[PDB]
């Protein structure tokens, strides 16, 4: 097994971490554990402080953050790390309460160049004679980690919805029934929207517009609920009055045609890298919406247009499978 | 001074 490690520019510090992807189970979140290796020369003055901070960044510092502070229960990883290192490997461990949000970064606009806009998790370690003598950044270490979730193993029932509406003057309502083939769709897997329609109204569908709409909200910001189209598909299939239609469209959300969008949430980036579309957010309690974080949800919208307009919306789960 | 690059290290399997 391998353990992560970062060094300090001064050469007097080193931070170890078992992983930078802490799986978030429904009831308990994995603990952040490691040991700081420090030089006894500056240790003679004062011991080491270790900081775990969680920060959310928006705008263009404009940041709201929670700073858990520890100044230097031993898990197996801690015991192994101390056994390998030795005397000065003073251990540390944070416990992440489940209500804290996961790592999600927004799509950067081409007009701006920032590191990220979203939640990040950080682990820090420095030496200082006093808590306010933060003069030299050269004596610190800054390592970034993430908290992630995976899809549940128990899918729900077949997502299905329908709407019977008489279009203006009409005799009996048009019946549109759309049924996805499951609720838990993995990232990029086709969404086979089974579409059945029958009609007696004089109206007829001229175009059928099928799209995947990503829904995301910023709980910190008031009235912040953003939805942008993804993988919009416009077929020209028609169903004249008194007919019956059935088709299996294979839609697929993707990033290529939506890279120019603003605010498209993606999975948390460590470096200035590129990641897939954001996964959905899980929670098992009736949790009050935590101040920090971005909640991401996906819905498929199927629309019909006539010479008026009707449409129904179907929610589904979009997450990576549990490894 | 600029920051260092996150690396990795080896611990025993047991």
């Amino acid at each position, epitope marked *: 097994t*391998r353990v992560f490690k970062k060094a300090s520019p001064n050469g007097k510090l080193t931070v170890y971490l078992g992983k930078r992807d802490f799986v978030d189970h429904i009831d308990l979140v994995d603990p952040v554990d490691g040991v700081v290796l420090v030089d006894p020369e500056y240790l003679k003055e004062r011991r080491v402080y270790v900081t775990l901070t969680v920060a959310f960044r928006y705008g263009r510092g404009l940041t709201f953050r929670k700073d858990l502070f520890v100044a230097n229960p031993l898990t197996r990883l801690q015991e192994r790390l101390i056994k390998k290192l030795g005397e000065h490997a003073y251990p540390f461990t944070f416990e992440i309460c489940p209500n804290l949000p996961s790592s999600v970064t927004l799509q950067p606009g081409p007009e701006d160049t920032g590191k990220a806009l979203g939640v990040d998790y950080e682990v820090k370690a420095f030496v200082a004679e006093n808590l306010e003598e933060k003069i030299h950044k050269r004596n610190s270490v800054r390592l970034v980690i993430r908290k992630v979730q995976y899809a549940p193993e128990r899918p729900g029932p077949q997502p299905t919805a329908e709407t019977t509406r008489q279009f203006l003057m009409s005799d009996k309502p048009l019946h549109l029934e759309a049924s996805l083939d499951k609720e838990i769709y993995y990232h990029g897997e086709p969404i086979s929207v089974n579409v059945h329609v029958t009609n007696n109204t004089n109206k007829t569908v001229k175009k059928i517009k099928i799209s995947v709409r990503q829904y995301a909200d910023i709980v910190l910001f008031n009235t912040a609920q953003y939805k942008v189209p993804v993988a919009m598909e416009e077929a020209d299939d028609t169903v004249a009055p008194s007919s019956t239609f059935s088709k299996v469209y294979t839609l697929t959300p993707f990033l290529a045609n939506n890279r120019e969008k603003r605010g498209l949430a993606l999975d948390g980036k460590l470096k200035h890298e590129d990641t897939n579309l954001a996964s959905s957010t899980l929670l098992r309690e009736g949790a009050n919406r935590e101040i920090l974080g971005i909640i991401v949800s996906y819905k498929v919208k199927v629309k019909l247009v006539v010479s008026s307009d009707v449409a129904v919306e179907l929610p589904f789960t979009l997450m990576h499978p549990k490894p | 001074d600029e920051s260092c690059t996150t690396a990795s290290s080896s611990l025993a399997k047991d």
Partner: antibody
Amino acid sequence: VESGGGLVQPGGSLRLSCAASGFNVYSSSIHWVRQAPGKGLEWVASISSYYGYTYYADSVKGRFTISADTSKNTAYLQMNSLRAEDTAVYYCARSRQFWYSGLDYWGQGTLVTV
Amino acid sequence: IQMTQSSLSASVGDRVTITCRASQSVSSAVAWYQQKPGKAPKLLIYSASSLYSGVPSRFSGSRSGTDFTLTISSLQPEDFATYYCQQYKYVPVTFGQGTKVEI
């Protein structure tokens, strides 16, 4: 399953056509590969339909132009200007394209020698 | 970037070892592929000694810093193909030379 190319004078362009059913062209990442007889496998091209990036080995950057059809589940390796060193067996790939780059799916490989 | 991995003995019932040493901090992102002559590749291992779902416990992997090892725990006549060690961390994805098995 794949329908190759050939029946051309040397130096003449072709266009591969590789198919492998079941997967999604977007969720899967379509990679292309070449192996010359007596030479080991070496990557040639790769296209990620979900991302939209295409990467080539520096030898064949300006000569090859890969393209895959979303609604047909097919890959094409358009070799605009080959030479006599491009006679080899070519395998198309359909790899998991999420925090993984293992080419854990494949089609048939067809010779491109005339 | 490049990786270096030629001919193994085909004595049945044995345990053999093949090394595929990197040349950079590839961070264990190594998968071992195998294809019988005439067929497309079939992966057996990815990352660190993670066997493929379609192969027995016979195959195995290892890791030591930037040094990698594939090891067949017990030679059985099922496999005498060539093994290709591949990295996926740098955009010029690279392969090893590959070794066949012939006594």
